[PDB]
Every structure is written in C-alpha cells, then in structure tokens.
Amino acid sequence: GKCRGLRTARKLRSHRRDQKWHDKQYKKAHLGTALKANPFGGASHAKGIVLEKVGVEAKQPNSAIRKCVRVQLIKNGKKITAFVPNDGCLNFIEENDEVLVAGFGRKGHAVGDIPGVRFKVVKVANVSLLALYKGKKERPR
Amino acid sequence: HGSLARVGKVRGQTLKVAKQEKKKKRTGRAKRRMQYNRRFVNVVPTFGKKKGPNANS
Amino acid sequence: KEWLPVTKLGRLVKDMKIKSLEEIYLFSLPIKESEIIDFFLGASLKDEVLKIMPVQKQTRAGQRTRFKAFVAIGDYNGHVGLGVKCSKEVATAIRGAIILAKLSIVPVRRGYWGNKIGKPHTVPCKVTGRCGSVLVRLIPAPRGTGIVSAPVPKKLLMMAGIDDCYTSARGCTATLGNFAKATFDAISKTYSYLTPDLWKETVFTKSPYQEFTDHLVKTHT
C-alpha cells in the first residue's frame, strides 16, 4: 500500500472497493447482468427439448465435422446448441426427446475446436449416454 | 464415403473380439507390493533413458 | 585414468599434508581440479541429472541444435554443488556438467530452531537468493517437519542435508536454470552471514603455503 498512518481507514477502504470493482472476474461474478445473460442462471443442469439437429464445422487447424444438437429450453425457451459427447450417438437422439443439458467445463466458455457451442448432453430420454454407449440399457420408444 | 454426414463409422465397421478369463487379485494389499518387486527390485531404470514396467521390449 | 597433479593444490594433497578441505574454505582457495574432491570425499557422493534442455542456434542452412544439461552434486553431511554444461553430444554435456559440479562446491553450516539438542537440522537464519526474477527465501523449521517446496528444491535439499526448511518463491519460476541457480545462491550464502556465536576474535593459523613453499619449489617449478 501507499497510505500508512493510524487514522487512515476511509481512503484505503474506498481504494480497496474501487480497485476490487475494477477487476474483471469479480465484476462478472457479482453483477446481475452476467447472471441474466446466463441461460442456466447458475444451474448445473437444465433439461430441454430438441427441435433440430445441425452439425457445426471445425476450426482452422483441424478439419472434422462434429455433429451437434439444438435444444430449446423449458424454463426460458431460449434456443441453445448442445454437443453430443460420444461417437455414433446421434441415432440415440431424435426430434422432441427429453434431453438433459449441462456445462462442459470452462465456466460457460467455448472449448476447443467447436465454435459457439459451449454445452453438451449427458442424459437423453431419462437415461445417460454412457449406458447407451456401453449397451447397459435400452432407450424406450 | 458418398454420404459425409453419417455417424459411428469407426464402430460401425470394426472387428469384435470376446473377453477372456480373470484371475484373483489381492484387493490392493499385495498387488502394489508385486508392483514394487517387479518395478524396482528386479529391474532398474537406466540413468538417462527410463524403463517402464509395461515396456514390452 | 591415473592422477598426475599439475597444480600446487593437487600436489600438496597427494603429498599427504592436507587433512580436509575445511582450511581450503578458510583460505578461500580456488579449485581447478575436480579429482581433489574425489581424494577427500568417500563413496557418499552421487549424481542426479535435472533436465536436458534442447536449446538451438540457427544458421543459413536450417537450424542447428545442441543439448544443455544440469546436475546436482553433494553428500548428505555437508557440502553441495551445481553444474551447468551445454554441448552438441548429450553424454559429453553430462560429463562436463559432472566435472563443473565437482568444481563449484560450497558447504552449508546448519543451525538449530529454538531449543538445541543433538545435531543441527535447519538453516541458521532467513537467507534469500536471486539471479533474476526469482526471489527465493529460506525459513528455519522445527525438527522433523520435513522440507516443503517445489520438488526440485526438495531433491536439492535432500542432496544437501537440510531436512527441515520452509520456502517461498516469487516470479517466473517455470525456468529451471534461473530458479536452480537462485536457490543455489540462497543456499550458498549461509556462511556469508554474521552470527552471534562467531563474535570471538579469529586466530590466524599458519598457512600450508607458508610452510610448504620450500617443498613445492623443489617439487614443481
């Protein structure tokens, strides 16, 4: 610090509050605008329904068309794109299915070579993709 | 080929091999002890070039 | 293979008239032969390669690379050391780093923490070292708490003998060479600190040069 005395508290309190308010992560984590812009609203998981299946292209260095699912939410109705975790599981998902959408790991940020899409699918038709991938259960039609 | 937007190709065409038998373990009591006596007691890593326990030379 | 002394220090220590390197550290004599330390110390000396760093030049015809090595030396009871070498062949760099680590060898005088019993196990004071952006600090520790640090101070201090020390670093500690040289400078400044037990006025013993000049002048000119 700079100011050093006995009765020096107000100026340093104002300095601490202003320089903490000028931080970026603290401003993101303590204002209602970022919580309003978040479709989940601080929720770990949020179920939705499927209206279309559009696969997005890859990025500049690598070229592999990775398939994705557009899911409309129920609590908000916003159209957010999800991403299938494993290989060949797009046959496990159909139109107007009961999917469960969660985050991917970067606190709501784009990850890797997939542009724009930030979410994924962990459960479809009230069963996980792991059981369908390992063939432990069967999706009921 | 032909239809590019088709998923599950690498598992759609592959080879399927069944499983095999399974022995008895020590539930980690002497399993890591066998790890110790087959990793450091018998063989040692060379100073400069390492040698793992699964290095099938 | 066979040792032939060329300097005066090697000839005097092979003449069997110097007991330890303690009086060499009193007189601060420079060491120019690596095998003198082999004459003093026994089989308690081992080596440990740190990391091979692939630095490179660049010329008209592509880029040309050579290997940069590090090694840590020092027995458990007493002295430490460090050596940096960079050459084309990795093996010659290893032997050169071993030789240069045998050249630069310094001791550390361990102290106690609070009460005093048995043998010293920690640093006598809070000493720091810096050769760049690294601000490394040594802290005295109680008996048997174990060193805690980055694990390359852990291997350096287990090569040293100080089993109880807290550390604190600051800066870009990703670079291994600068950080290792900084903690070497921090551990080498142990004797360069005035202590309350050492305020007795020092005596000046007779130098081995002062007694054996007449022997060396007839041994080698």
Place this chain on the structure above:
Amino acid sequence: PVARSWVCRKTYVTPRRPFEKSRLDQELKLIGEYGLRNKREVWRVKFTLAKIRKAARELLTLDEKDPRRLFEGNALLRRLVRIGVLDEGKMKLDYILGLKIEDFLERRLQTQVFKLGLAKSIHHARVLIRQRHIRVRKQVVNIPSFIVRLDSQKHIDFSLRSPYGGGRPGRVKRKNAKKGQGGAG
C-alpha cells in the same frame, strides 16, 4: 428438535500433490512391511502425528513457566508414555518432534501380534485378529487398528473358545471327522 449428535470430523487428508514417486514408494513400503489394507490407515496415522506435532508447536511457541503450557505439556507427555512410544530415558518436551511414522505404526495390534510370535505372517496376523481368536483382558478384539498401551502388553492371549489355544474345534475338523465316520460305515 431431535436428540441427535451431528458431531462428525475427518480422519484422513489427501495430499496436494496428486502423483509423485517418493511419497508413494514410502507409503508402499510402509504397507508392504506393515500389512495394511489401503492408504487410509497410513493417512490416518500421519494425520494423528500431524495433530500431535501441531499441538507440540503450539506448546513450544508459548513462554516458559506458564501453567497452561505445563498442563498440556505433562498431559501430552504422560499420554505418549502410556501408549508406549517414548521410554523412561527421554521424557522431555524436545523429544516429541523426533517421532516418525514407525513409532505410531509399531503400536498396531496386527504388528504387535506378528512381533509376539503367536502367528506366522503379517497378513496371517491381520486375519487372525479378524477371525476373533485373540483377546485382551478377557475381552476379544476383532479390529486390527487397536492401539496397544504399554501396561496392557502382557495381556494378549487366545480366547477361551478359540480352538488354537484350547477350546471346542471349529466347523472344519468336526465336518472332516463326521465325513470320515460316515465313509467308514
């Protein structure tokens, strides 16, 4: 409003470093030459040693000739005397910092029974405690993590219904005898 406890505390702590060869090899040697089951026992003993060392550091950071420092001083000293880790030669406050993992792992019931010569192997000693054979002070103990105190060290013996030290034979001998008598006639 219920008559409940809600008093729960942890016993093992996980290290900050996830994977490193030195401490893993050290605790592997401790399990191999002490016959533990997993890392939970050695982590629990390390946590108890850390608590004792923290209490010792809190005692030594106080000033001399203080009644509280003396109070938990001879309290902790007499407790480590009664467990059977220290001895009658070194009962000073500066000898508590020189304790190792071996000093607290030696007082386990499994290691004590293995060192008593009443069993064959370390794992055999652990299962022999686990099979409810060996009692202390006319009371059987099936738990291998029993800290043996110094005074109760000559009171380790087989129970009355343990077949190895006198008693009724178990299922195997009577089944073998019944099968032999059935096959004889």
Place this chain on the structure above:
RNA sequence: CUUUAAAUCCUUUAACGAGGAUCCAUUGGAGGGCAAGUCUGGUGCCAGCAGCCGCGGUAAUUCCAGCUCCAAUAGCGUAUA
C-alpha cells in the same frame, strides 16, 4: 435368548453354511503436466480423442477393439457456486 408399549437393529448360543472360495470388485486413463506399452488388428483430415498444447493425409507410443500396465479402491468420474 435379549432389546422393545409389542416388534424389528446389534451381541450371544444351537443346526446348516466356500478350493477356479461364480459366495465372480467397480471408475477414469496410459504424448507432456500426469502415475502408467513406440503391444497387436480396423477407417485412414472421414468418423473421433483432448479441461491446455495438440493428435488424425495408407505402418496412430493419443481414435475403435483383446492382453499387460497405472491411481483410489465400495468407491470413482462430470457439471455448476
């Protein structure tokens, strides 16, 4: 038999009660951090792996399958504050 308003839970004693003790121990990984195979077959910038760097173009120590290995072991992995 005991506890219990009466039961059930624990302990005790009877009679049964395992030889591949099928009375079968699961979860993520194996290029670096990050402990752990340049093992063997398949498509070969397609399908995928990957929190970061990147790996995939016709012999992949990273993809998909079998053995071996490596971490905690009735526990382990993912997301969110």
